[PDB]
Amino acid sequence: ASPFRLASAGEISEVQGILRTAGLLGPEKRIAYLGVLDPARGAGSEAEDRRFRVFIHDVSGARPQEVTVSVTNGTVISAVELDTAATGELPVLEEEFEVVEQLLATDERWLKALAARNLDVSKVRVAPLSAGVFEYAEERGRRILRGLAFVQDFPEDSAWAHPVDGLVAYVDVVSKEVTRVIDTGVFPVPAEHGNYTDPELTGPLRTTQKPISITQPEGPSFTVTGGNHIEWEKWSLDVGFDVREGVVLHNIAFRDGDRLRPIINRASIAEMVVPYGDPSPIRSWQNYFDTGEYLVGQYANSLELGCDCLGDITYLSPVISDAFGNPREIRNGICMHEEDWGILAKHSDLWSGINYTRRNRRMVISFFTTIGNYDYGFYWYLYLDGTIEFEAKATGVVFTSAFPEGGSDNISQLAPGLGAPFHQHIFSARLDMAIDGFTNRVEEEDVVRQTMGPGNERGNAFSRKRTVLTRESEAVREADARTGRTWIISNPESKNRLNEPVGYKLHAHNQPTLLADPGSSIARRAAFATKDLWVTRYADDERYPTGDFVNQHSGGAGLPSYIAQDRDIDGQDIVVWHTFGLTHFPRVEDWPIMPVDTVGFKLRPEGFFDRSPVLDVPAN
C-alpha cells in the first residue's frame, strides 16, 4: 500500500492500454521514457493516485508528446505536443542506435571513406552518438545522431581497439538521411587487438587467489517489506528505480529513540555527463549525457551472485517499459546487502582500565549499468553512525581515437597508434533535503585562520565561519579545498539538546568541475557541471539539473533556469544539487579494459543527534 512501491509489470501494461485506447500509441509511436511520478507534497492524507509520465516519439515525423496518465483511474491526465526545436528532443531510443550503421552502409560518401582505408563495410561498427547543438542550422528541430567508426575483425573482437579517425558522419534518424560525411584525412587504424579474454593477451591466468567466503549464517540484518521498503540498524528508506536516473532513494530516515527522524526525502543521480576535450572536429562535438540523453536505468545489468555482488544478497528486479509499452523485467538489477566496515570506535583507557572496541558496517544499495563502452556502478551506503555516502565506480573500455604523429595535448597513447581523448565524467546528485522535516537551510562553512596578536598571542588559534544561503541568487557555490569548505544542511526550527539546529554536513571530494570554456555549448547545456553546489527551492517540475529534454537542447535548461527564480531558501523546502566528477587522462593501465576508479561524496550528522548514535552497538 506504499505509494513509493516499485512499478509493477501490470501498471506498465495498464499505461500501455490507456495510451493505445486514447489513440496515442499508433504504429509509428515509440515510448522514449516512461516512469512513475512521486507523490505530491501533502498526499498522505490518503487516496493513492499512481501516475506515470511518458515521452512519446513518432518515427513518421509527427510531433512528440509528453503524456501523464493515471493507472489508478485509467485516464490521460494530460497530453501535450512538444516543439522540440524549443524544448529539446526526446531521449535516444535503444532502437535508433543500429540505425546509424545501417544508413551509413549504403551511403556513397561513407563507402568511399571506408574504401580509401581498405576497410570492409561489413566489419565497421558505428557508435551512434548524441549530436548536441553546434553550428548546423539544418539540425534544429531534427533528431540527429553522429557516428564514429570502429573496426571489428571478427564477431568476438573488441572494436574499440580499432578506431577509424579522421571520419565522422551525421544522420537524421527520422528522415533516414545521411546529412554530412566529414573526412579530414586518413589515420592509420590501430592494429593491436584489445581482447582481454584472449590468452595470448592475458597470459596464463593466476592460480594464486584463494577464496574469500562471506556468509551470514542467520541471514541479513535488514528487512524488506512492501517489496522495496528497507529497515536496517535504525535506518528506514524506500528503494525506487527509474529508467532515467536508475536507483533512487526515498524517505531516508533514522529511528532515534521513539522518533523516526527524516533526513533526505529523495536522493538520486539526476544527471551525468561525459564531455570530451579533444579539439579535433572528428570529436569536438562529443558530450554524452549518459543519464539525460541515454537513460542509465534502462541499461542496468543483471547482476550475478558471487560475481557482481558477494555475500548474502537480496535482489530487486525492477520493471521498465520497452519502446512499445510492454513491461520488461531487469532480473537482479539491484543488489542490497550489508558489509563489514572495519572499526567503528575504539579506546583503551589507562585511567578506567576499560578497553573498548566496536565494529562498523554499512548497508549497500547498488546497480551497474552499461552505456556503450562505459560501465558504471552506482552505490549508496548507509553507515551505523548516521553517515550517508554515494560512490560511482567507473570501468568498461575507454573511448578511443588515433594517436597523432607528433603527439597530442588532448589525447593520451594507450597502445601503438591508439589514442584516448581526454574527458570528464561529471555527476549531479539531487538531494531533496528533509533534515528533521522540510524546513531546511544551507550554510557554507569555511575554516578561518587567525592572526597572531592580542587574544591570540601564541598564534595557534583557528576557527570557522558559516554563511547562510538565503536566496537562490546566492546559492551557486564553488569548492575551496584549501579552506576546508563544506556545506551544512540544517533545520532552524529543530534543535538538539544543546540548543543548536540539527544538521548534516556535506563533504565533497573537491575534484575539478567542468573544464570547457565558459562560452562553449557544453558549458551552457551542462551548466550544472561548472559549479560544485547548487541549492534550489523545491518544485514538482524541477527534476533534472539539465532540464527534461536534454538531447539537442540549445542550452540554459535546468539549474540555471531554476536558480533565476531567486526564491527564498532560508528555512524552506529545499534541494541540494552536488556536482562531482572524474577528470580522466587515460593511462596505459586503462587499456584494454579499465580498472575501476571512483568518485563520490558523503554527508555526516552535525549535531543531528544528542550524542553518538552508536553507543548501543554490542561487542562483536
Residue 398 binds to Cl ion (criterion: CB under 5 A)? yes
Per CB under 5 A, the segment of 222-230, 392-400, 523-531, 569-577 that binds Cl ion is: 392-400
Q: How many residues bind a copy of itself (CB under 8 A)?
A: 153
Binding site, by residue number, is: 288-299, 371-376, 423, 425, 584
Question: Hey, what's the cell of 338?
Answer: 550489508
The DSSP string of 453-496 is BTTBTTS--EEEEEEEE-BGGG-EE---GGGT-EEEEEEEEEE-
Residue 433 site contact among K ion, Na ion, Cl ion, none (CB < 5 to 8 Å, cut-off depends on kind): Na ion
Residue 283 binds to Cu ion (criterion: CB under 5 A)? no
Per CB under 8 A, the segment of 44-52, 103-111, 436-444, 494-502 that binds a copy of itself is: 494-502
Q: Please identify which residue in 42, 108, 258, 458 interacts with a copy of itself, judged by CB under 8 A.
A: 458
Answer yes or no: 538 catalytic. no
Residue 66 binds to a copy of itself (criterion: CB under 8 A)? no
Residue tagged active-site, from 33, 374, 383, 504: 374
Q: Please identify which residue in 14, 96, 233, 242 interacts with a copy of itself, judged by CB under 8 A.
A: 233
Per CB under 5 A, the segment of 76-84, 136-144, 309-317, 582-590 that binds Cu ion is: 582-590
Residue 74 site contact among Na ion, Cu ion, K ion, none (CB < 5 to 8 Å, cut-off depends on kind): K ion
Residue 294 binds to a copy of itself (criterion: CB under 8 A)? no
Closest CB to a copy of itself among 340 and 568? Answer: 340
The DSSP string of 557-581 is -SHHHHHTT--B-TTB-EEEEEEEE
Q: Please identify which residue in 205, 225, 258, 406 interacts with a copy of itself, judged by CB under 8 A.
A: 205
Write the CB contacts of 405 (distance below 8 Å, at least 6 apart in sequence). Answer: none
Count CB-CB contacts under 10 A for residue 134.
Answer: 12
Residues linked to residue 315 through DSSP beta bridges, in sequence order: 335
Cα-flanking dihedrals φ and ψ of residue 362, to 5°?
A: -135, 145
Stretch 545-574 residues interacting with K ion (CB under 5 A): 554
Binding site for substrate, by residue number, is: 288-299, 371-376
Q: Please identify which residue in 584, 591, 603, 608 interacts with Cu ion, judged by CB under 5 A.
A: 584
Residue tagged active-site, from 38, 165, 278, 290: 290
CB 65 within 8 A of CB 36: no
Residue 74 binds to K ion (criterion: CB under 5 A)? yes
Residue 441 binds to Cu ion (criterion: CB under 5 A)? no
Euclidean distance between CA atoms 109 and 366, whole angstroms: 45
Q: CA dist 200 to 124, 148, 194, 587, Å?
A: 24, 28, 11, 22
CB 353 within 8 A of CB 370: no
Question: Hey, what's the cell of 597?
Answer: 576508479
Closest CB to a copy of itself among 412 and 440? Answer: 412
Contact positions vs Na ion (CB under 5 A):
432-433, 538, 573-574
Answer yes or no: 532 catalytic. no
Is the backbone of residue 166 left (phi > 0), alpha (psi -120 to 50) or beta? left
Residue 105 binds to a copy of itself (criterion: CB under 8 A)? no
Binding mask 263-292 for a copy of itself (x = CB under 8 A): ------------xxxxx----xx-x-----
Q: Please identify which residue in 11, 443, 444, 606 interacts with a copy of itself, judged by CB under 8 A.
A: 606
Closest CB to Cu ion among 283 and 584? Answer: 584
Residue 371 binds to Cl ion (criterion: CB under 5 A)? no
Contacts of 328-334 spanning 24+ positions with Cβ under 8 A: 329/9, 330/300, 330/302, 331/302, 332/302, 332/303, 332/304, 333/241, 333/300, 333/301, 333/302, 333/303, 333/367, 334/239, 334/241, 334/247, 334/300, 334/303, 334/365, 334/366, 334/367
CB 579 within 8 A of CB 428: yes
Geometric angle at alpha carbon 25, from 21 and 29, rounded to 5° = 175
Residues linked to residue 576 through DSSP beta bridges, in sequence order: 431, 535
CB of 274 to Cu ion, least distance (A): 7
CB 287 within 8 A of CB 273: yes
Residues that bind K ion (CB under 5 A): 74, 554
Q: Which residues are catalytic?
A: 290, 374
